[model samples]
Target: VYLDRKLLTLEDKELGSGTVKKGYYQMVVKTVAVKILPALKDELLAEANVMQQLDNPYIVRMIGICEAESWMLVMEMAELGPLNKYLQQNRHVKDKNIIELVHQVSMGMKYLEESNFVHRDLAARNVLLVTQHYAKISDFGLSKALRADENYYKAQTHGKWPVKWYAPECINYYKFSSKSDVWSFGVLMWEAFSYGQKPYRGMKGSEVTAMLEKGERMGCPAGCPREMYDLMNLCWTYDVENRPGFAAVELRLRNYYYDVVNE
Candidate 1:
């Protein structure tokens, strides 16, 4: 899936990730988001490869790759943009609507978990919205595909980390797995319910690490349902082995969503 550089018309509209720009795919005459990389770096290739293997309604679709002056990753545009921004803009979003979007994200994470892919950066900012209620997971730049025999990937080198969303094991050992992603999902849910408020408000990464180390967790977001908060707590369990998997999380959310919808 290669696209000619001339076929894409870049627009001035920019995304939260400064690297991404709005564009039009001439071949398909459709709107797209293009992530521009200075060179064909291994990280860019890794991101493309991971997205290429993923095909799910709740996962952002990679249209193709274009390499001309720079490496361009062409992907379907999310009309509502990043989940965090969308939630903030729509301050009056209903509880049921938020649950629906979060449930959709859990479904995508379930697929990634089953495929042995660890989304090292799962957060509200990384989720994109196709519609008011339809959410899709995005940002594969830090994702890792693990082997069948491997349970976790340990970082050999460290760069910037989303420490607030990280699990204790990840913060202490630089380890990542589906379980770590689950911890991040809990934080993402907190963001959604709080209308995009930063996790551990006004706290530094080191402060967050210390809080987690002491077995402290954020309380339920304002107006968040008790059941939803309980599920988030499950994801924040101290023991990685005890944290519920995405499959279980998705099922629980689905049941909760249906209960709300039917009421």
Candidate 2:
């Protein structure tokens, strides 16, 4: 349905810092979500364009955009909330269930990878759960298409980011690539296993920097399966080039899925 905030009876669900309101769509009689964004014309246009270009079930769907009184995004409502929220709410949930969530996220990442898209911020918080069990990737605010000339995207910034989810190259040299995204995906998997716990425990930023510089990484989550932890470690290797692509990651998750199915 077309968006007219004034016309719609909106409720403030308080989804996140950027989210302003969520309510039912009068035309369709279904719930919808809205995010109020700062007016960054070029960035807004790029984000909307990227969402338009991406047509996959694993990705969140953009319903409409409003640039009137404020920059707003009309979005589909994922009733199950964010993956991180789900994990936190279900701390004692089975490992197989968590693995399924990770597999679904990997499928979304694999699709994004094949589409030549780089989701610079890949984390559990950025993933939304649809229905009860299916997960879909969200938040394209830091997404961009990879260039043919350079496999890596060089960023220039000094702001608060999901640093714990970033790769070594990304943190040190502003280097971002699909491989770096794979690194973040590993951290995402760790979050899934740890039930939305923060990475690096209570280490300070300086400590984290020094530790990674010394070639250290996060240990396996408590009670995490060895095979899954091994895959996470591969993604955390010091050499970014050694990380597997999303397709390969998806394949590994699928193998685990089959094992579960057959058992």
Candidate 3:
């Protein structure tokens, strides 16, 4: 649905990237976020269409599109901001809470997997928090909606890719699939447990790619649970078929969280 520009009041508070700003929707008296894009309204609309179809608690909700002088995307606000920044600021967060947040993102990713969506980028920075304990997947700029019969989306153009979070196939072939998303999820889990440390820290993108080709992976972060690290390794499996689906990942995290809380 398209929203009248007059109905929204853009605030000066910038959210994450400068493109997105905190705002208020005057009609509903609710706080929201506005993503300002320079041009390519059609392409932005396509992204919004994909987001509009998604209806999950863990996914950010799209309110409407504002076709002002500059095309803007209005969506529900995630008050706590980006998960990476959140984790970094609260380094003393309890392990159980950390696991719980990761588990929530898994549930959201599982929904995306089932819905035939490939979130080409699935990193901690793309995930936003509604509360300290609640995380929602955001930033669908690199996301694509696949046909029911299609298993992967071959990228037609090359740009700056998230090398550290990318699966080998994605980096090598420019192909994206839910399995690749699984790989990024693993890195995201590492980011979470490491309190937002950059993956393959101090290395260039090309160097990280070479490291993956050499069959080496980052060791578990200090204090990260063995099961969590093992799960990350599963996601980093060279064989895409060997990688666990989000469905399996979500279940494992859910079970692990239960065990942790009970302990």
Candidate 4:
């Protein structure tokens, strides 16, 4: 059964077993699917209006929408599992794949930045892989409405929701500037580092979150390339003002993707 190629239309409940969202073999091919947000509203609209407006191939594509009781969004299903599944003990991805995947993610983030938007929660699991070498970024993050400091275009204080993808300063001071996004981009780099290793394995979510609140950040993963580690560390710098923007990150990763030769 395939949702993309139209193998079948609808299958019995017993035929389903992929995601909680409930997917089955549509035709003779195999695929997965999910409900679009606007479909819930029952109005025909563009999924890309908020997300698709950006021009990045790495981002997921919204092929079509099904308007039933729920808004069914047909998308290119990512075969690889989420970061949670990948972070389990003794699992890993290839270094070349990691470099290429995160490089693409940074490109997407860079696109968002240029458009005055922020992913707010650009983490590992949120990035879905279609193959070992490629991935697509997911999750909208309009939550970033203000800077980390109490200053805002409309309000005085930036809000908070404990997004784990952020760095220390943004966590503690509630700063949500593009600079903080860069810090998280470093973590995003780290997530790609050891194949989506937990932010701090064996540590409580609270502990890692606390460290981020204080502007402290973890170093590159244990087995990451030295050059990549150095670049990631630079991203986790104490001074938010010093963090490299996505533009810079894209350039570095682009070079690394082509130049690095692993032994």
Please state the error at residue 134 of candidate 4 in Å. 1.1
**Where is model 1 more than 4 Å wrong at Cα?**
16-18, 38-40
Query: Which candidate, 2 or 4, has the higher TM-score?
Result: 2
Clashes of 1: 0
Candidate 3 per-residue C-alpha lDDT over 1-263 given as tens digits, one digit per residue, 9 for 90 to 100: 89988889998767656288999998749899899882467768888998999999999999999877688999999999888988899999988999999999999999999999999889999899999889999988778999777899999888878889999889888889999999999999999999988899999999998998999999999999999999999989988988889999999999999999999
Query: Where does model 3 exceed 4 Å of error?
Result: none
lDDT by residue (146-214, candidate 2, tens digit) is 887778888887456788888888888898888899999999999989998888989887788789889
Sorting all predicted structures by TM-score, with the top scorer first, yields: 3, 1, 2, 4
Predicted candidate 1 versus true structure: per-residue lDDT over 174-220, tens digit per residue: 88999899999999999999998889989999998888879898999
Models sorted by lDDT, best on top = 3, 1, 2, 4
- In candidate 1 the C-alpha lDDT for residue 233 amounts to 92
Residue ranges of candidate 4 with Cα displaced over 4 Å: 1-32, 36-48, 83-92, 141-162, 202-206, 209-216
Worst 10 residues of 3 by lDDT: 38-47
TM-score of each: 0.96, 0.92, 0.96, 0.71
Poorest 10 consecutive residues of model 4 by lDDT?
Answer: 11-20
The per-model lDDT (C-alpha) reads: 0.91, 0.82, 0.91, 0.61
